[PDB]
Amino acid sequence: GLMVEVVESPNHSEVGIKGEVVDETQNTLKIMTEKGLKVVAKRGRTFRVWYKGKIMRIKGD
């Protein structure tokens, strides 16, 4: 149930869309919205994730 809303990519809103997430607690975090898919670490771009357990928000810098 890795449903996430993600805003990433060097731009005010390059790839930000309703997207899916992979690797929530595995290692790194990769999310794809619409303009494309970007891969970053705990620190990078702004993403909000929703799982079948709880909801958390992670923002870089």
Side-chain angles (χ1 to χ4, degrees), residues 33-52:
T33 80
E34 242 201 329
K35 200 58 164 282
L37 83 171
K38 217 98 222 314
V39 303
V40 283
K42 302 186 222 190
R43 306 297 198 172
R45 291 62 262 162
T46 302
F47 49 110
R48 65 204 55 191
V49 295
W50 315 291
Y51 228 159
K52 248 76 224 218

Side-chain angles (χ1 to χ4, degrees), residues 2 5-7 10 14 16 19 22 24 27 31 34 42 46 49-50 53 55 57 59:
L2 265 174
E5 169 269 84
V6 189
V7 281
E14 169 120 59
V22 187
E24 213 259 272
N27 269 81
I31 342 80
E34 242 201 329
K42 302 186 222 190
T46 302
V49 295
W50 315 291
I55 61 98
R57 269 182 170 78
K59 186 176 160 104

Side-chain angles (χ1 to χ4, degrees), residues 1-38:
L2 265 174
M3 203 158 143
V4 56
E5 169 269 84
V6 189
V7 281
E8 294 229 26
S9 312
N11 222 28
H12 294 175
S13 269
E14 169 120 59
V15 197
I17 256 279
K18 249 192 195 178
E20 312 130 38
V21 27
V22 187
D23 310 292
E24 213 259 272
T25 27
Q26 204 163 300
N27 269 81
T28 179
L29 251 172
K30 319 156 58 255
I31 342 80
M32 174 220 288
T33 80
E34 242 201 329
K35 200 58 164 282
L37 83 171
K38 217 98 222 314

